[PDB]
Structure formats: structure tokens, C-alpha cells
């Protein structure tokens, strides 16, 4: 029946790439950008 | 740095100066009380904020107040 993740909805390939980007690809760049922002010197 | 303020209810008992672990306080001549002395806080860049000076004060209310302010590496008591 459900051997893997599926989408019975329109553009069901979008979770497949959106969950990696939002959750483990773009976050460490965002953390690096915020760390460089809070540690930059006057 | 913290702000240590001394008010005119001071009686020059020196107990705040003796209780300071970091030597912020000293006694200066006043002629505003009969001891002839009043506390002063010039080296308030050294103040850690322990408020031992306030615990040592006998006047009600206190003649010395410490206001914890901007934290530096000296007021945080950091040996690292």
C-alpha cells in the first residue's frame, strides 16, 4: 500500500524538494548568515 | 560598569569600604557628618556588583546604592 511517501495532490514533487530546502539545506547557510551578522565588529 | 552612588545620609562608618572585595570605594573628608568622612566610588569600573557594600551599610535606607549596568569583563568577574 504505502511503501514510500506519496502525494495525491497537485505538484506532489514539491514536498520532495521543499522539505530538504526548508529543513536541512538552507538552515545552515541561514545560521551562518545570522552568526556573521551578530559577530561583526564596529 | 555599575554605578555606585553615595547619599548624604552617610555617617562615615567605613564599613562599605572595608567590605568591598575589589577596592571600588574609599573615604573622603566631608564635614557633613560628625565622623568627617563620606564614601566615594571612583574605581567603579572595578565594581563586580556583589553589593557587600550595601549589606555593610547601617543607615536606613542605605547610604550606598549599586545599580548594575553595562557588563564588562571586569564586572562579570571573568578570569577567562
Amino acid at each position: 500500500d504505502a511503501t514510500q511517501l506519496e502525494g495525491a495532490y497537485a505538484a506532489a514533487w514539491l514536498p520532495w524538494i521543499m522539505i530538504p530546502m526548508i529543513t536541512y539545506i538552507l538552515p545552515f547557510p541561514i545560521f551562518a548568515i545570522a552568526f556573521l551578522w551578530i559577530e561583526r565588529e564596529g | 560598569s555599575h554605578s555606585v552612588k553615595i547619599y548624604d545620609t552617610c555617617i562615615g562608618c567605613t564599613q562599605c569600604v572595608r567590605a568591598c572585595p575589589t577596592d571600588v570605594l574609599e573615604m573622603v573628608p566631608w564635614d557633613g557628618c560628625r565622623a568627617g568622612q563620606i564614601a566615594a566610588s571612583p574605581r567603579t569600573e572595578d565594581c563586580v556588583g556583589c553589593k557587600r557594600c550595601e549589606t555593610a551599610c547601617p543607615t536606613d535606607f542605605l547610604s550606598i546604592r549599586v545599580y548594575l549596568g553595562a557588563e564588562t569583563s571586569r564586572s562579570m568577574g571573568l578570569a577567562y
Partner: protein, 31 residues
């Protein structure tokens, strides 16, 4: 009836307007 792929892509493209308006308001409020 169910939504189409083009209806999801319209949403994705149209949310770029609040997405960059939000960035403009965030930088106008000056961190």
C-alpha cells in the same frame, strides 16, 4: 475537483510579492 499544478505555481510565484515586501519592511525597520 482538485487544484492544478499551475494553480500551485501561481501561488508560489504570487507569494514572492509578500516575500520580498517582507524583506523590504524588515530592512526598513533597521536591524
Amino acid at each position: 475537483m482538485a487544484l492544478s499544478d499551475s494553480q500551485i505555481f501561481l501561488a508560489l510565484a504570487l507569494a514572492l510579492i509578500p516575500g520580498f515586501l517582507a524583506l523590504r519592511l524588515a530592512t526598513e525597520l533597521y536591524k
